[PDB]
Amino acid sequence: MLSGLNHLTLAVSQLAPSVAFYQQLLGMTLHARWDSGAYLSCGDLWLCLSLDPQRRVTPPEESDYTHYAFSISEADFASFAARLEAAGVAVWKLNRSEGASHYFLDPDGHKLELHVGSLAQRLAACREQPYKGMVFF
Amino acid sequence: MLSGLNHLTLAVSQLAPSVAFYQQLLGMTLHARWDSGAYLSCGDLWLCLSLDPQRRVTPPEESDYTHYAFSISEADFASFAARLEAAGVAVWKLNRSEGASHYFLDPDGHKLELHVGSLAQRLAACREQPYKGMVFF
Numbered sequence: 001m002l003s004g005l006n007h008l009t010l011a012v013s014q015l016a017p018s019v020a021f022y023q024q025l026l027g028m029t030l031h032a033r034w035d036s037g038a039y040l041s042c043g044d045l046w047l048c049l050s051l052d053p054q055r056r057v058t059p060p061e062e063s064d065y066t067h068y069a070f071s072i073s074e075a076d077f078a079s080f081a082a083r084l085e086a087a088g089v090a091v092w093k094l095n096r097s098e099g100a101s102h103y104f105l106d107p108d109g110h111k112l113e114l115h116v117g118s119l120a121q122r123l124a125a126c127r128e129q130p131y132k133g134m135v136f137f
Numbered sequence: 138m139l140s141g142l143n144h145l146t147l148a149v150s151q152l153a154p155s156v157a158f159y160q161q162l163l164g165m166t167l168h169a170r171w172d173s174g175a176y177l178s179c180g181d182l183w184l185c186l187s188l189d190p191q192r193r194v195t196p197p198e199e200s201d202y203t204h205y206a207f208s209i210s211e212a213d214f215a216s217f218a219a220r221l222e223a224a225g226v227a228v229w230k231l232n233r234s235e236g237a238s239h240y241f242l243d244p245d246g247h248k249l250e251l252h253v254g255s256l257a258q259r260l261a262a263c264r265e266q267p268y269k270g271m272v273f274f
């Protein structure tokens with residue numbers, strides 16, 4: 001039986017800017033680094049950056065909607081978004097759903113998100129206003 | 138600050154087979170589905186499957202090392218991996234370069250993994266068998 005997400009690994013084209021982005025800009029904790037990767041944590045999340053020459057710096061129009069959302073409190077959301085904006089981090093989508101969301105790109109074009117709100121909050125909102133074809137289990 | 142992974146969203150090309158894979162084959166909990174997506178949980182993980190006409194079924198030699206690992210206990214690991222193998226689930230990696238792991242593909246080629254152990258345990262193992270150039274902070 002699977003008990004949760006064990007780790008998220010992102011392939012990166014250049015290790016130093018990716019470490020700078022996740023540790024310094026995004027505030028994650030750097031636990032270890034080696035010639036071809038790094039381990040960081042963000043709350044319970046174990047993040048691995050893996051240096052991969054096959055990673056392309058990918059424009060957002062050229063990747064699908066797969067994306068990785070990090071939790072932040074409502075109270076901290078606006079100043080964190082402003083930090084990303086000051087750093088010139090590109091946005092790939094505007095928020096049109098429930099709960100604050102800021103959609104931003106990492107240095108290689110990985111699609112990231114800041115989101116406020118849990119699955120339970122989303123399901124409650126959906127029960128009141130179900131999406132087209134929605135069924136609950 | 139950021140406090141963990143709020144959700145993982147995977148773009149899928151065919152919603153029903155992807156729901157079946159995550160719910161039936163992997164045992165995740167299905168909470169809701171709609172014409173364009175589904176919400177599942179795996180322990181604390183909120184997984185969203187999002188129907189995306191841009192998603193391509195991608196062979197593993199065509200994608201980078203970005204991947205998603207799910208936690209499983211030492212007692213359950215081998216039989217779950219063997220069940221995936223017997224069910225014909227495609228693989229993408231054999232060499233255990235980061236501990237006890239089984240590397241397998243979802244229907245669209247998303248790179249998945251079963252892994253036994255925490256970040257703390259992986260750091261302890263790496264102290265004895267470090268990756269090249271490894272530094273610990």
Ligand SMILES: COC(=O)Cc1ccc(OC)cc1OC
Nearest residue numbers: 133134135156157160167170171
């Ligand atoms: C794995 O169970 C589901 O994915 C639920 C379901 C099954 C079939 C179906 O339409 C044929 C619609 C469904 O939910 C909206």
Ligand SMILES: [Mn+2]
Nearest residue numbers: 067069113146
């Ligand atoms: Mn999202």
Ligand SMILES: [Mn+2]
Nearest residue numbers: 009206235250
């Ligand atoms: Mn892994």
